[PDB]
Enzyme design. Structure first.
Site, PDB file in Angstrom:
ATOM      1  N   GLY A  34       0.810  -1.216   0.000  1.00  0.00           N
ATOM      2  CA  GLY A  34       0.000   0.000   0.000  1.00  0.00           C
ATOM      3  C   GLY A  34       0.848   1.273   0.000  1.00  0.00           C
ATOM      4  N   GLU A  35       0.317   2.352   0.562  1.00  0.00           N
ATOM      5  CA  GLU A  35       0.975   3.645   0.476  1.00  0.00           C
ATOM      6  C   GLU A  35       2.197   3.747   1.367  1.00  0.00           C
ATOM      7  OE1 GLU A  35       0.884   6.383   2.942  1.00  0.00           O
ATOM      8  OE2 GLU A  35       2.123   7.580   1.567  1.00  0.00           O
ATOM      9  N   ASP A 154      -6.464  10.818  -0.491  1.00  0.00           N
ATOM     10  CA  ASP A 154      -5.974   9.870  -1.528  1.00  0.00           C
ATOM     11  C   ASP A 154      -7.120   8.962  -1.983  1.00  0.00           C
ATOM     12  OD1 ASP A 154      -4.110   8.497  -3.106  1.00  0.00           O
ATOM     13  OD2 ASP A 154      -3.130   7.540  -1.362  1.00  0.00           O
ATOM     14  N   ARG A 158      -7.776   2.281  -6.096  1.00  0.00           N
ATOM     15  CA  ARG A 158      -6.819   1.399  -5.466  1.00  0.00           C
ATOM     16  C   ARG A 158      -6.915   1.471  -3.948  1.00  0.00           C
ATOM     17  NH1 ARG A 158      -4.146   5.781  -7.464  1.00  0.00           N
ATOM     18  NH2 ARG A 158      -3.893   7.426  -5.881  1.00  0.00           N
ATOM     19  N   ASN A 159      -7.620   2.472  -3.425  1.00  0.00           N
ATOM     20  CA  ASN A 159      -7.750   2.657  -1.989  1.00  0.00           C
ATOM     21  C   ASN A 159      -9.182   2.426  -1.518  1.00  0.00           C
ATOM     22  OD1 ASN A 159      -5.064   3.253  -1.709  1.00  0.00           O
ATOM     23  ND2 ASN A 159      -5.313   5.482  -2.049  1.00  0.00           N
ATOM     24  N   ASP A 172      -6.900   3.011   3.471  1.00  0.00           N
ATOM     25  CA  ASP A 172      -5.606   3.733   3.254  1.00  0.00           C
ATOM     26  C   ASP A 172      -5.718   5.145   3.760  1.00  0.00           C
ATOM     27  OD1 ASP A 172      -5.810   1.297   1.269  1.00  0.00           O
ATOM     28  OD2 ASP A 172      -3.734   1.917   0.955  1.00  0.00           O
TER      29      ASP A 172
HETATM   30  N1  LIG Z   1      -7.852  -4.832   4.530  1.00  0.00           N
HETATM   31  C1  LIG Z   1      -7.465  -5.411   3.391  1.00  0.00           C
HETATM   32  N2  LIG Z   1      -8.080  -6.560   3.012  1.00  0.00           N
HETATM   33  C2  LIG Z   1      -7.706  -7.157   1.873  1.00  0.00           C
HETATM   34  N3  LIG Z   1      -6.778  -6.777   0.998  1.00  0.00           N
HETATM   35  C3  LIG Z   1      -6.195  -5.627   1.399  1.00  0.00           C
HETATM   36  C4  LIG Z   1      -6.485  -4.896   2.535  1.00  0.00           C
HETATM   37  N4  LIG Z   1      -5.738  -3.710   2.564  1.00  0.00           N
HETATM   38  C5  LIG Z   1      -5.021  -3.779   1.472  1.00  0.00           C
HETATM   39  N5  LIG Z   1      -5.261  -4.908   0.712  1.00  0.00           N
HETATM   40  C6  LIG Z   1      -4.619  -5.318  -0.546  1.00  0.00           C
HETATM   41  O1  LIG Z   1      -3.311  -4.787  -0.533  1.00  0.00           O
HETATM   42  C7  LIG Z   1      -3.134  -3.880  -1.651  1.00  0.00           C
HETATM   43  C8  LIG Z   1      -2.298  -2.706  -1.213  1.00  0.00           C
HETATM   44  O2  LIG Z   1      -3.119  -1.742  -0.571  1.00  0.00           O
HETATM   45  C9  LIG Z   1      -4.554  -3.545  -2.093  1.00  0.00           C
HETATM   46  O3  LIG Z   1      -4.598  -3.258  -3.469  1.00  0.00           O
HETATM   47  C10 LIG Z   1      -5.318  -4.806  -1.801  1.00  0.00           C
HETATM   48  O4  LIG Z   1      -5.045  -5.739  -2.845  1.00  0.00           O
END
Ligand SMILES: Nc1ncnc2c1ncn2[C@@H]1O[C@H](CO)[C@@H](O)[C@H]1O
Ligand SMILES: Nc1ncnc2c1ncn2[C@@H]1O[C@H](CO)[C@@H](O)[C@H]1O
Lengths: 293, 293
Positions: A34-35, A154, A158-159, A172
């Protein structure tokens, strides 16, 4: 400095409501970066009163983490502990003692909205009704944050996470800021948000408000209608300064109504006060929903 | 804001010394993601007077680039156009018109030092003499930058390139700053440099000088002796605040002399004025080299 003060407090202050025994958490595969760090899938034993194991996601830093990333992980904890809404991802716990800092959050079985849409077809079959539903759910979660005087900063496909039942969960929050006092957040240095999702006054003047979140929601609306398309396609990010200031915007995409495109354009007005608020946006989306039946 | 002023000037000002025709550049495979974008391998026709094609590397942004990343690409151009040293990577050109901003830089056939070392064995066979040679080359390049009143701020094995002849090239200047005026650079917000390479006064007080580059060089010296090892192994980055302030440092690694380890410790003194300058470091490394023969 500010971060060492935060880190120390986080480690020192042990809010029993949130602290979770590391020995009760088992980490599995990486779900993403993620970020600010990586997210892995995990399982947690006797989490929040729940008998047995619960599947969760865990946010953590990588070994090469910068101070910016650590700040963002602490920021995300600080915000998520204060919010509770069916379309905002839930914080369950944290591990802050005797090992790396871990945030334990709700697991969303379908992953990011952008991934979910790109795996689908417009008719996984998703109808325009489904898409409008997704957008509305997100607008509801943002009405709530905005009422809480939180700016996400943001918002992007994707978030957004897609949970059980195809329910949207805004996520995020590492970059999210409280604007209770002044109704804006300003960042003196450069943002770490992708250029193609920022409002024109955020990009040029570094000003963030709930109205700049509305601009980003317009870009998210375009991502939704294109089933995960890439905004300003084929346009280098540095050209967005000149493009936006001379009044250009994304064109209407293929399978997009005139009404839905007008909503995107209103989200992208140059003057923030001319954009809808999230309450208006939800109302527009509800009306498009019932008109379609 | 500051970035739109920079972008516009870069696009407007077309230093003929540096501008290169896009039609003469062909892009190939991706070599990496660096600190602000991606680097690809490329070839350039009639570059800088040279007949025929020259193999080069090209730094560019990704579609999701943030303002921070764009600023860093422009920063890197601004610094690289001013420096010239056999152990600093060379800028050949840029493309700033009619397409994405591209920097054209010297191609280093062996890639990053950290990758190069991790593919080797200590006796690719590399001797301790080779390792000391690598460190010295890097110290020479840093003496030069320091004399130029430039602070690199992200010295690490992942940011040293290994060219033809196993020659070191300091690279990744996106975060580098001029300290001619005040002899320090201070950043009010959080750094985007990995915690485990920053000097204690950079991590706590956000102060960067050539002496904090000396601290990072000590960590680089440890990476070199461990053939690409991971610093503070098994230690979460957020614990480095408490670890460094209570006076702890990395332990002497396996195949490392007492003299080389004392050099690392001197680089990591709490008080920046007690650390060696790069001229001292080169002298130490030269002496270890001749003593070994
Ligand atoms: N709480 C979450 N549950 C499931 N997948 C998650 C979660 N947070 C992030 N992700 C995954 O991780 C990636 C990075 O944020 C996202 O695109 C998603 O695929
Ligand atoms: N000038 C260059 N020549 C060759 N490889 C490069 C160059 N700059 C960066 N890289 C590669 O891209 C990665 C990201 O910086 C590096 O680890 C290295 O593998």
């Amino acid at each position: 400095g500010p971060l060492s003060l935060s880190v120390d407090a986080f480690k020192i202050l042990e809010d029993p409501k949130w602290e979770f025994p590391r020995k009760n958490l088992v980490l599995g595969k990486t779900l993403g970066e993620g970020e600010f760090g990586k997210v892995v899938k995990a399982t947690a034993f006797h989490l929040k009163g729940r008998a047995g194991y619960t599947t969760v996601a865990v946010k953590m830093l990588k070994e090469n983490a910068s101070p910016s990333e650590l700040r963002d992980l602490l920021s995300e904890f600080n915000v998520l502990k204060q919010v509770n809404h069916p379309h905002v991802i839930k914080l369950y716990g944290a591990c802050s003692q005797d090992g790396p800092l871990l945030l334990i959050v709700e697991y969303a079985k379908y992953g990011s909205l952008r991934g979910f849409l790109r795996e689908s077809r417009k008719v996984r079959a998703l109808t325009m009704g489904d898409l409008i539903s997704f957008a509305w759910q997100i607008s509801q979660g943002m009405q709530y944050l905005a009422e809480m005087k939180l700016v996400h900063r943001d918002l992007a496909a994707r978030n957004i996470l897609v949970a059980e039942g195809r329910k949207m969960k805004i996520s995020d929050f590492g970059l999210s800021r409280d604007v209770y006092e002044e109704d804006s957040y300003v960042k003196r240095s450069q943002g770490r948000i992708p250029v193609k999702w920022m409002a024109i006054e955020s990009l040029f003047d570094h000003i963030y408000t709930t109205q700049s979140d509305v601009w980003s929601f317009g870009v998210l609306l375009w991502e939704i209608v294109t089933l995960g398309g890439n905004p300003y396609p084929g346009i280098p990010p540095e050209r967005l300064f000149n493009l936006l200031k001379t009044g250009h915007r994304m064109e209407r995409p293929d399978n997009c109504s005139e009404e839905m495109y007008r909503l995107m354009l209103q989200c992208w007005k140059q003057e923030p006060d001319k954009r809808p608020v999230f309450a208006d946006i939800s109302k527009d989306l509800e009306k498009m929903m019932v008109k379609r039946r």
